[PDB]
Amino acid sequence: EPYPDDGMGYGDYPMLPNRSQHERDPWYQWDHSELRMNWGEPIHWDLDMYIRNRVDTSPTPVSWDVMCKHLFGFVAFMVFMFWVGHVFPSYQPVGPKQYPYNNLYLERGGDPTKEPEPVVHYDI
Amino acid sequence: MLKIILPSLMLLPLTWLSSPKKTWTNVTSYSFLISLTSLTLLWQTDENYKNFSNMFSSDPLSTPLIILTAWLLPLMLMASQNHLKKDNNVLQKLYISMLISLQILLIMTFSATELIMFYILFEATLIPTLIIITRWGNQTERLNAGIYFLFYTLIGSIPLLIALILIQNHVGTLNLMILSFTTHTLDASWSNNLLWLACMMAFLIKMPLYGVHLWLPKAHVEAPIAGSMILAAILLKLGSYGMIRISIILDPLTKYMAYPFILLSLWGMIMTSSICLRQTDLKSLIAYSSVSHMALVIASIMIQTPWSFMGATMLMIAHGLTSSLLFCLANSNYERIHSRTMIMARGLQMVFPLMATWWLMASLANLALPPSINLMGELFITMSLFSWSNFTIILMGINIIITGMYSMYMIITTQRGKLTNHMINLQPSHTRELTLMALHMIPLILLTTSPKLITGLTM
Amino acid sequence: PNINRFIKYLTLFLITMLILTSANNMFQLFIGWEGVGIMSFLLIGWWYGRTDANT
Amino acid sequence: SGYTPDEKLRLQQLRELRRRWLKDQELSPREPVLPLFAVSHVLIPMWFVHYYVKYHMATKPYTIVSSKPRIFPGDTILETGEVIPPMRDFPDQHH
Amino acid sequence: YSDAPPLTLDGIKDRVLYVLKLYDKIDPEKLSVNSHFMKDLGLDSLDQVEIIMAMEDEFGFEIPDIDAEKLMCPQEIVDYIADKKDVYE
Amino acid sequence: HIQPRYREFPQLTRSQVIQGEFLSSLMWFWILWRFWHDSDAVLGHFSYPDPSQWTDEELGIPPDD
Amino acid sequence: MGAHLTRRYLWDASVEPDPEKIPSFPPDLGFPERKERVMVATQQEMMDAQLTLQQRDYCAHYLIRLLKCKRDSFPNFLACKHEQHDWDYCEHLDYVKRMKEFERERRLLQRKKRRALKEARVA
Amino acid sequence: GKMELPDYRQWKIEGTPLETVQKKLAARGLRDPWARNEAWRYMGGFAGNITFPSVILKGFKWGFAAFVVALGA
Amino acid sequence: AFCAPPAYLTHQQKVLRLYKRALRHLESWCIHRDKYRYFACLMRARFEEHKNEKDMMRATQLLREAEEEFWQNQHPQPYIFPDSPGGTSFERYECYKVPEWCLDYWHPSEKAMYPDYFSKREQWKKLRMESWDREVKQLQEETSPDGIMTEALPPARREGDLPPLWWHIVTRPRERPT
Amino acid sequence: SKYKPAPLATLPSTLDPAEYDVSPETRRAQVERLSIRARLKREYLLQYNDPKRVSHIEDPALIRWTYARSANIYPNFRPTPKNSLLGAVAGFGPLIFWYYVFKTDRDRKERLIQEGKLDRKFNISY
Amino acid sequence: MLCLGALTTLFTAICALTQNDIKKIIAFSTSSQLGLMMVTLGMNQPHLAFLHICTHAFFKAMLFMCSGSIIHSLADEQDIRKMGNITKIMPFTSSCLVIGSLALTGMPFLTGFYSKDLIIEAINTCNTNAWALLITLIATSMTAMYSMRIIYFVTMTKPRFPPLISINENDPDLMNPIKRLAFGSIFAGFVISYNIPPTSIPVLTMPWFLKTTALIISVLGFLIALELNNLTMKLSMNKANPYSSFSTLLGFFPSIIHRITPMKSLNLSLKTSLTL
Ligand SMILES: CCCCCCCCCCCCCCCCCC(=O)OC[C@H](COP(=O)(O)OCCN)OC(=O)CCCCCCCCCCCCCCCCC
């Protein structure tokens, strides 16, 4: 069944089923073992992509749609829940930590010459 | 610089006068020493460029190449001793001489003060190359490939001829030294905007740009191994050397007249890198690898920042050595396999243990593994490109991911997997094949120890 | 049949890993970062014949 | 099903030959005809390294730099001779 | 050492014999190599599937479908297993 | 020379059992020894204050009005 | 995790503090001449003991002690144990403070809600 | 050494969990034919049930014995 | 792997090859053994009934609803043996299965040692060339009248003749090269 | 849930109606196709197992593939729509996209440098 | 990274619960522990993150080589399904495996305990995503679950391995290193924590349920899983939940993002960029 005549070059090259070498019977003694292709059988146009070390088209126990929806659903729910989180964070009943001097103004590398507005912390 | 050249010329008398049986060793042994004399130019204990004489000069940019041009003639003559060992004893001495003239001409072109000396010698190199590709080319299509290699370069060449004669009238001498120390500032007219394109286009063509690179895949495919080594290692870099010395003039326009090429090259880098991903002919994949890794160079010789330039100088010398190494090992598979197809010949490490180590190191040079000059080069072009526009990392970032994929795929489907059942049994590796490789990589290891020598004019 | 090569790559991995650990300038950190990546490629697919290891 | 009577003989016979091939693969006696150190690579490498670290690195500027040593309150500085003042007394003893 | 001792045919031979002697339907005192399953011992088209599967689990490998639609004789199993495992005795 | 066993409990070497009990018993000696010497796995050793028993004087809660 | 969050997120947050602004009210509010914190260590002592900026807390002083007894007593890493309790305590006695401050700010905010309504006398 | 193999007869389903599976299968009328093959799993040596505390607590007896002694000294 | 693939599949081999996938995909769900051996003799029951259906149409309607019941009640990670396609050791040792036509390019020094090995190898290569003629002729004289042609190859059928196209089923690289 | 083959995750052999077919015509093909394969198989198997052979088994089915894919393309090119519209969006589309991505950035950068905002601190290289 | 570290922790842990390959389960645990390591870096606690890296190395290395011992001793069986009762057949590795398993589950006074609970309570005390805080803790219970899955299926169950038995772990080269790392797994957390420089100013003051949360969640994680393992033995068909397969085939990220990207990235080169 020649590839459709739309003038993109395929020519007379057969339009062989788009199935990857992955599901070619893995036990049969394929002449070319690793391409799971026999000698003489028409090679597929994109056998450079269906090779085993590349893409696969091997039936999956779960339907593809079911997969795409489920995966992304999970992703979304998670991303969302993480957002519910940022909205409502978890923080202990503890006030802010208190650093000495002027919040270590000079040591945080502050300018020695210009003194900072004193930030004082009182007991209790 | 007439020791790197006169002794070279004398090689021609030796290839002809010498015995048919001893012709190969006299020529290869002597040019190895010719390379040793070439190493003297590296002795620059000061910044001043070394103006040997009126017509012949060598500055940091040319010196790293003249040595490579002299170095590959030995190797080219060692990689073509097999094919070309079936010839009539006068076809050989022609091939050997053709290879000899290429570096005589290329040594002079890279070591030329007058820009039109570059042009005459620049476009002469096509004669020796076209003969090597067409006369000894294995495939039916080399007549075609030769035509493509002659016309794309020639149509670009005549505009440069008009441009350089034009500047001589405008300034009064095509001497690279003076042109540099003289005020040639183009005036952003519509015409100048054409001059700039005239000068750069001929160089941009033999440095395959995305728009005009179809000549290189076709040429290296049917070219004999020696021609493919010369085209990838020295011939394409002739275009880069030209762009570095010609943009000294046309200083103002490239600030805004480069965008077209820069974008052509960076998008080109991605597409050329990607089609390598599914190309059945190994020589085809290396050639497009060469287009992409050379598309980075035209995008650094145009941004024009100090780092770009020496990123370029680092990568050009490095990629030159790596590409040949890849083209040389591709040939060794081609001669035993007898087909260029990548899919056949799977599992070779199982049968050719060492060639596979050379294949692995060549691929790691091909992709950017870090203690290699290849990476330093890309890291630098990448930096400047980022400076030009932070967004550039995206496109120079899709290329790095693709470059890793095709480089390893060449190793994974050629040198791993189950062995091919019974192709014509693959005779073991000759010591010549392995040395021809060792001679490519041992210098790649040594240069990576001291990158300063191939850093370019800028640094 | 190739125990010695396997041990050889394991120590090369350790050398790249430690270089990655103790690297002041990041260029050396890069040498380690890429370096363990390549030897992992060589060592994950030790048994090259198996396509699964290659994938 | 069951093997075809003419396939249980092409497996009959070819198995018989495989058994002989594997016997032939067996190597005859003689088949392969061939025609503290610890200190060694810990001490010898060491001398060299030291030679390198104490006479190149050490000598060159800013090649081996070290975080300042730690000095606490009440501990003496060997080089200058000063004794770091003891700190202000900790008032609380609450555990 | 860690790898077990290589199978010797006269062993593999006994092992396949043994397992069958533990299948209740197959008489333990008649199972005789060369005693075809469906013609002599009386097993059914569906038993064979299992008899093979037991063997695939006694020797730890899979007898492919097409090559196992024929493990009839209780011996074919003993040379096929051995041929697949390279036992030249 | 360990002998492969068919449908029987592999015979075990003296050393296999002793080394195995050894490593496990030291694990338990260490867990017990540290638990006794340093039982700060639970409570740390600092008690959480009840934030809801701080006299309004303690926190500066002015007398309403 | 905790109830405090439930108060703020569930129900109403009007009277629940915002962690980003814990001393939201006047610092002196509630205290005549409240005493400010005091640091035993010296801006230099710390700088000479190379204490990480973060570790320069009001317990920096008991830390320096620990670190002293950890350099001294080197081969023995299990003997500077009293020093660690002390540091930790100092810090527990700081975490508690940071908790007392949070509770005080909570209650004070409530004062506002109470007072507003009280002060919001009908007429 | 021409490894021998335990007598096939040795294996029997009674006394193992296969027997209870055997009896309920018999209630349905099924005969559970290959159950005898799966007997050595439960037959001997490996017959004892393994409890999760037993693994987590392996060696605890001496471990505590060791602890007490050390604590004493 | 050894025998050749039949052109079309019968009804039986399709049913009897489900009994394998099914029971083997029931031992991934029933990780234990007594549970399995139980839940499986219950499987046979399912296949045991509907064994004597003579109504093909029906039979191919029980089969087509069996393999859909199965597809939706299969385990995602089936227990596939270690050395079988899709396994964990599949083609692991293939990096050591060199193809044996490579010992022909060995240096006379290498083959100098290992002497008796090559004395027997040269015998076998004499066997191979000594019969290619009688073999190919056999392969041809026995080409059944043009028509259906299967990949099955003939046995020997005469003394001295070596069962044909045999050089690569015998002389196969050993499985575990180790 | 019925398995739903997508261009990927295709319909398995089982669950495929065609598999369940005995119409004598179908069986006819299924037995005709083995013949082509058996024929081709017995044309590979007594030419690869041939003593006295050194030449390269060619696998012409692979040579028909490469020729079809790199030297039988332009002789079968006819410029239609859906081919030239799609043959210009691919070559000039992104090439024009990035130009307004790089021009706008380079112009933003230049303006900022000109007005004096870009910090360019500790940048002593380029 | 606190957020993505958190997602990987549970995502990888949930996938590990149903994986039936012993090496695969340990590898997912490698990712889950690093997910916890990513979380501490995300909560800006660098020093403790490094502490877990060192402790993580000792026990994960042990469990892998422990399974290396089981896989090599058995006829290269890499599936928990066919491997059982290693505790009586091979006590030396089983002892090493449970030592490693408890370290992975943060058993009190073992190397995981010194660094891991510091990280847990750090979370329970900092200001963080609520979703991240909840997932990290159940991720900890799952670590106990899959840890439970390995020992129940691999060690405490009737044997299901192929009938001929040839097990030897006597080789010094097996024991010695396994023995040496076991000593490290038992004592390393003790040594590293005391010796390192005081850093991070931890918060040891917590309500007791947060102080002991890591311990309890780990305990019930195993408790719930043990209930599960026990459940299976019955002659009643449970199979698995609809989201169980979702778990077993790795969340379906492999099935979908590995078939689409490599397919729509290569199709565009051959069909569009190369030929067109
Ligand atoms: C594949 C990895 C992709 C990773 C993407 C990472 C994106 C990071 C954020 C980039 C976009 C925001 C940059 C913000 C910088 C500060 C704000 C700013 O002023 O942008 C700089 C400049 C102007 O952008 P803007 O403000 O949008 O003004 C547009 C006016 N028409 O910016 C501009 O010059 C204009 C364009 C801005 C947006 C450019 C979007 C680039 C898209 C890249 C696609 C990559 C894939 C392409 C296909 C590959 C496969 C074939």
Side-chain angles (χ1 to χ4, degrees), chain B residues 267 270-271 389 391 394-395 398, chain J residues 94 97-98 100-106 108 111, chain K residues 268:
Chain B
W267 177 255
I270 294 169
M271 295 297 103
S389 178
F391 282 78
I394 299 138
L395 295 174
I398 309 190
Chain J
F97 182 77
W98 291 102
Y100 294 165
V101 176
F102 288 163
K103 183 169 71 172
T104 49
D105 192 36
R106 289 227 72 220
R108 181 177 65 83
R111 156 180 50 182
Chain K
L268 295 174

Side-chain angles (χ1 to χ4, degrees), chain D residues 30-79:
Chain D
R30 109 182 187 270
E31 216 55 18
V33 182
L34 295 174
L36 63 169
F37 287 96
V39 318
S40 171
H41 61 78
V42 180
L43 190 56
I44 292 302
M46 258 200 302
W47 277 309
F48 281 102
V49 173
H50 192 274
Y51 175 77
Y52 184 69
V53 175
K54 179 196 174 55
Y55 295 145
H56 297 285
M57 293 190 180
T59 65
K60 295 182 303 180
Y62 302 133
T63 42
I64 320 288
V65 51
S66 68
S67 164
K68 289 288 190 176
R70 297 210 161 190
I71 46 187
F72 310 102
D75 180 65
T76 311
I77 299 178
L78 289 182
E79 313 203 13

